[PDB]
Design a protein around this ligand. Structure first.
Ligand SMILES: Nc1ncnc2c1ncn2[C@@H]1O[C@H](COP(=O)(O)OP(=O)(O)O)[C@@H](O)[C@H]1O
Ligand SMILES: Nc1ncnc2c1ncn2[C@@H]1O[C@H](COP(=O)(O)OP(=O)(O)O)[C@@H](O)[C@H]1O
Ligand SMILES: Nc1ncnc2c1ncn2[C@@H]1O[C@H](COP(=O)(O)OP(=O)(O)O)[C@@H](O)[C@H]1O
Ligand SMILES: Nc1ncnc2c1ncn2[C@@H]1O[C@H](COP(=O)(O)OP(=O)(O)O)[C@@H](O)[C@H]1O
Ligand SMILES: [Mg+2]
Ligand SMILES: [Mg+2]
Ligand SMILES: [Mg+2]
Ligand SMILES: [Mg+2]
Lengths: 483, 482, 483, 482
């Protein structure tokens, strides 16, 4: 409930002027670069690399939750959501009379008076329902959260008495029911504002059509902008009924409420929406946007998106014996291991580096990734192979597997790794030099020259000179390597 | 669309006192009938300087909001107005009480004073029309915009009837009569608020029962016009017989009045009208035939083509655009698109999108040829047939359409957003040809800002042809210091 | 649409203290005189007598609409409806919390603390749903139409953007249906509010439950005072469905909406609700105020109501040969002629003057009333004798009977009055005499003797002194006559 | 009425950790619970001057708001509380996972370590109470207020259950079993929001099937009590005979727990208890016999009657009233009403209304005798049997009820409303008695105002009696000009 006083900006577009619902929203000019400025990545330094192994493991355990790199389609989705929100208030101007009054006074103007022609049906071209479809585990939900967290949920109005709910979310659970969607809407609406609509209308006595009609009444009462329905895949097909009647329910849901609606679903939901999507008849709506995994070869050349993302992710590792450069084959092996799917790309790193922290040397190679895939990605094999196969039915039918119990596995492996006593060559050198952490400089020195000469000579140098500047150490240690 | 009715007089003799006709918009000449359909986009001058994604979206919005009234729409508008206003004469609701007049005439004819009388006359005002034209010539967006002037639902206070002016049905994908019959109900229950589909559209009823049952609903609401489009699909299917389906379309006369308009590709005409009793009912009010625009009328350039192309060209969104359209661009446009209406605009839209993608920011004939060779693969035989000039061969290739064209428009928008990503840092960050010094430059990034450090390693290999790397690591700092 | 800004009077009763909805209503301190001020009547003078017979016919035809004399039951109905209207807003207090918050707070206080006892009885609806059963032709509809129109319909508030609809009127028609009442409520709300609720809520697709569900929402949104369903007698039982399920439907209407509701009917409709009426159960409610015709006698003496109405109605006669005093024989006869039913008593007197203006002498006789009775009370012969019988079944069977189309018959009475040739001697006397305010003396003293000498004597005096007031004229015309 | 649940500890050991008991209002001692029930009208100090109708309405409202506790109510409250909070120990929803405990007990019994173990405990029968007393003694008004403290629908959020604490069933006049069975569903889906009647109470099932479905429905929701009122209509009606009437109430053991309560008139005892297996189920938790109060207790006056009458006496609303009650009026009440509590308040209300009607404006013995002899006729045999005291004679007439009392009250209200008022100018018309007076009045209105007109008319007759109207006029006008 981020209630703010309704401050009225001025919109350059003449169509959106004078509506208390549109000008209360954030301005368009400052939000142009906000979509591309939404990137968030962990700031790492050799200080964090210096810490103990268990602290490093804890730090690298939280990679898949605080990392985000925007892609090309991530801006198209933002633009579509913005135009969907700001194109759906032209009909609900509170100060000006409703649409029917406009139609009636226009029709009396054309009869006698002076008005040559009137266009009665004004097409709702700017705003339409969207039927987001993409393979499970591609990044649909998190991108939606980070796009939609920019708009404040509640903007209270004082001159009028209306509560403006800019957006809303509905989340379906496992094997849910049709009435459970309406109950989820009621619960989320009560959560957002503080109302008690469940007490008044949440009784199971009424039918589903009553829920729909009362939902329309509530959505007309409050200024409602967007209605997002999430994870259509989880709806059970047994107790629900026919796919035809589920499609009829969704079509009726789109029309009755009167505000734009956004649906998210698996490619198996395309089977449900086969009938309504084939038809090109106007008024059906349901424009489709296809999320796809990152492709490599476009115009015969490797893509820039994958290279940039791979470098930016590879910069986020904490290993003593890593390799700075990235080989073409090293990239390729886990490319065809992962097939480009977004969710398992970070999973492969967060499993492989963690496993290498206990298997031995702290380096990444093709064999390590192959072993990790073969011994820790057991369920997701057929979908990953079918994506290479390319048969649309094979891809569609065997999707929607989510390889559960990942975080528990990460914590169990973390505690297993923490249960250890074996030494490593470099920690006794760290404790040998000092606890003052001049190992920050030692790392810049040790990679090029043998430690058996540096450690005594840097100890003598630090005895005669209490602490050399980090810039000035390398020339003088060069002098001792030159003597 | 519940528009209340207010009456206005009409000068026509036969429509003097009729509560259905007088509630419609007044009669208009050809000055405005073929001029009110015009629409165009705004494109203020301040919209040229914006992000590339917004411009791509605005370009993609073009084909839905552009309509140029040609020299043919006036005839269609006049025919539609005449057919709508000429089917209400036989269904006058406000009738002077005929009981007393009929009885008085009855006594006068029984006593011998009056030798003749007209007691009652049935309805004889059912006429149809067919409209066929080549695919992509715009037979549907030239009908929605014409019929968007008349409001659908009119409610009268004096009586208790609702006037459904027009209703549009589309044929299914496989082709049979029963889905048309049930889709009439499925398209009727949406304009009003009702539940006709579940109450009447049951499986027990046969086809003849549905046809005899449509009349009661078509008389309860004063239906004016019923347009059936995409009649193409019913040429050959599991309909039970071509002659049986033709018998259906001719026994659709028993529906009360309601003049109907049929729309189909030129493949429908020869197969579908091959008998006198059905041919005379298809062209009951003239069969309007359409054709693509011709470049040369009689050796003189047509003003229609010039005006349409110039008005389309004045709707361009590029940073580097030439204001005037050179003759070669128009000539190449007509050579590629070949005249059909739908391919004239698709070439322009795709050319603009691919010019945005390539970064040329200019439209040229070579780019149009490239797009026509690239994306319009399935339609080529139809264009070559129109180039040939053989009427039968053109009739054979007359139902070719681009598949998943809306899908391709999205895939061209995705590439736009990727290339726009460009930041000031990688004027020095994005070059890997400097050296492999980036192995150690990672620590050098935090040491100082690379005001000259990136040029320092850049000047390192320029100054030094070859040197051992292990000596370069401190000597780069020597170059950094000096 | 009397959108007056709410002026908040103060009422000394503790229950109505500081309620924004209640205070906007008119005050009740001298409403007894206001309730007794409903009386309305035409103004008639002696001038209208000398007009032509068509003008008198129009004047007589104007009497039924603009005559109203309050009786005993009107005061009781006014006070009861005032109690129902004003007691209906103690629950929906806008400034403080609603009912559910009060019950929850009471439960939380009785749980622990020292609030020993809390009563959960709450309000049954908010006032009893009165059922005003009475015989047709008694005058219910006009009584409500006048005593319910002294309250402004809409009180448009200022700080709260809500409309305080104070009363409403549903009305069924011949051969109605169960869903027709639900549709008509929505349709009639538009005329009171000016909106288009029928477009969004009046779809025929909705079931009977959804109509009531939406009615609950809209009745809670707009502060509603009353809901007067009228003419249940017109409904047909078999067309709607099960007759015994109508009582279930009406109980569901009373329970869900929550605002006070008052039905109207005839003893034919009583058998629908008789199951709840016989039981003294609290919660069934449906208290009945029985409407009965005027009784002639009280304690072995004529009832004062009958004579009080009779004299007042008898003062409106403008007969030319009329005597000042009403004779006792006709007083005895028309009660048994009409059984005291309120509607037809006035109708007999209306038709008597029209019949006497054409049949001959201008007076009132028992035979004239008998002749009118056989003329224009043919459809109501069975019900009148059923009332005479006194058996409840005979009265119940013959209820709902009304005379059709009396107004059209009045027009043909007037047309027949228009076409006549011969004239009365008094018509000759008024025509030949200069009847410009000189007529009054002649009329007031015409019946003393023959007017043959009177016609020139008044002229002699008037020409003797043209300038006189009638006040001084009367002694002189009286003095010259006796000579 | 969906009150959310907040728990509280209970001192009783057996009600340890069971939400159903602990979600209810806490225990109170009898005197407090039997003293918190009293209520009375406001009786504002200065509301003794008003219109007659408003005061008449206030007096008519008296019977619905006057309640006064007595001795038996505390015992009734204790029994009701014990029944409601003693039938919930068998059903404790909060149970730990009993699979492991039961299987471990089975293992230790099987291996020979243990010797005995109680696996599953099943409930047996149910408690029941019957409350019988002569009609009009307050067996329903004293039950709609004792049960008012307990909330009806408690909602558990941690679980998903609704606790329907109490439910009131009333048999109809027919007395058939299926009416009771369907009325249970009516009351239950009136308490909650549901449609149980259509889902279960169809015509298809027989009596045994609904009787068995009541158990499932009363275990799905946690019932606490079930009171059946007016059982006297099941004595000898068309319910299949007294044998099946006994068998149905005996077979009502199969309903799970839910201690039932039976209320009836003293005649129902003989019909309802004639077999040993049914009487011990009727009086399973006592058998309290109500009886009207008496003036004396043991050679001395009873204080409860004194308190009841004295407290009732102040509540009257009259212009001039004797606040200090005279003992003669109390003796008159005990002579007429004889003790039954229904008649005591009705006599007072009717006497007050008739006192306002007559204008005597005082409550005295004569008015009480007149109203008792006029109105309360049918109740006479019961009172005359009460005077004698013979058990068979009093048992013969313990079912009589006065009808049409509400209609009589409404007609009395109309009578006192129709008093109206007489202005002095209007009264002047009534002053004129001879018909000639009124005739001369009617002729002589227009010229003269009535105030001066009536006196000179009256002296005209007081001076000269036998002299005619036309001869009267000159002398009247002679008086008038002067
Ligand atoms: N563009 C992205 N950049 C970085 N991480 C991403 C991106 N998209 C998805 N992820 C990662 O994928 C993980 C799971 O994605 P999720 O939203 O669950 O997809 P889905 O809902 O389809 O399973 C997230 O923890 C997130 O870190
Ligand atoms: N006069 C016109 N100007 C510009 N575009 C037009 C015109 N007429 C039709 N179109 C284009 O044609 C398309 C519609 O073609 P349509 O009528 O569906 O073909 P078909 O009748 O073969 O189905 C629209 O997208 C519209 O852009
Ligand atoms: N005080 C009165 N004076 C004259 N007419 C009355 C009076 N009260 C009622 N009426 C008559 O009652 C009639 C309307 O009541 P009625 O038709 O019985 O109601 P409903 O239509 O509900 O049966 C009117 O025609 C009116 O003449
Ligand atoms: N404690 C009481 N004090 C005063 N009046 C009472 C009391 N109990 C009952 N009454 C009166 O009894 C009437 C209801 O009687 P009821 O209980 O229905 O009789 P029964 O139990 O025979 O059906 C009420 O009008 C009420 O005034
Ligand atoms: Mg998801
Ligand atoms: Mg088409
Ligand atoms: Mg009526
Ligand atoms: Mg009782």
């Amino acid at each position: 409930a981020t209630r703010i006083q309704a401050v009225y900006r001025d919109t350059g577009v003449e169509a959106y002027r004078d509506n208390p619902f549109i000008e209360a929203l954030p301005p368009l000019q400052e939000s142009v670069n906000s979509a591309a400025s939404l990137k968030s990545s962990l700031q790492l330094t050799s200080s964090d690399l210096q810490k103990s192994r268990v602290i490093r493991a804890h730090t690298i355990c939280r990679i898949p939750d605080d990392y985000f790199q925007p892609l090309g389609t991530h801006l198209l989705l933002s633009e579509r959501i913005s135009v969907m929100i700001r194109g759906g208030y032209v009909g609900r101007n509170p100060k000006t009379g409703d649409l029917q009054k406009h139609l009636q006074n226009g029709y009396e103007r054309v009869q006698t008076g002076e008005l040559e022609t009137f266009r009665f049906e004004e097409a709702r071209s700017t705003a339409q329902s969207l039927l987001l479809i993409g393979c499970s585990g591609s990044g649909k939900t998190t991108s939606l959260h980070r796009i939609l967290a920019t708009y404040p949920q509640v903007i209270y109005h004082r001159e009028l008495n209306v509560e403006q709910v800019v957006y809303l979310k509905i989340d379906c659970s496992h094997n849910g029911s049709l009435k459970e969607i309406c109950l989820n809407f009621f619960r989320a609406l009560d959560r957002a504002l503080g109302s008690n609509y469940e007490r008044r209308y949440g009784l199971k006595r009424h039918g589903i059509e009553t829920m729909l009609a009362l939902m329309s009444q509530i959505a007309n009462a409050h200024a409602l902008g967007l209605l997002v329905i999430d994870e259509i895949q989880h709806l059970s097909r047994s107790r629900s009924g026919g796919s035809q009647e589920m499609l009829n329910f969704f079509v009726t849901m789109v029309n009755i409420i009167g505000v734009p609606v956004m649906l998210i679903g698996t490619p198996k939901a395309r089977e449900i929406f086969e009938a309504d999507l084939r038809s090109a008849r106007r008024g059906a709506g349901f424009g489709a946007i296809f999320w796809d995994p990152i492709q490599q070869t476009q115009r015969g050349k490797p893509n820039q998106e994958w290279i940039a993302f791979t470098d930016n992710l590879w910069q986020l590792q904490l290993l003593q014996r890593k390799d700075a450069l990235l080989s073409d084959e090293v990239r390729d092996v886990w490319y065809e291991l992962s097939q480009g799917v977004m969710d398992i790309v970070v999973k492969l790193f967060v499993l492989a580096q963690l496993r290498a922290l206990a298997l031995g040397n702290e380096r990444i190679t093709a064999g390590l990734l192959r072993q990790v895939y073969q011994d820790e990605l057991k369920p997701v094999h057929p979908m990953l192979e079918a994506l290479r196969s390319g048969i649309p039915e094979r891809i569609a039918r065997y999707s929607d597997l989510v390889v559960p119990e990942i975080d528990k596995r990460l914590i169990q492996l973390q505690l297993d790794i923490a249960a250890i006593q074996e030494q490593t060559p470099e920690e006794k050198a760290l404790q040998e030099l000092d606890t003052e952490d001049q190992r920050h400089l030692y790392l810049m020195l040790k990679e090029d020259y043998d430690s058996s000469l540096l450690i005594p000579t840097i100890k003598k140098a630090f005895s005669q000179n209490p602490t050399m500047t980090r810039q000035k150490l390398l020339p003088l240690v060069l002098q001792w390597l030159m003597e």
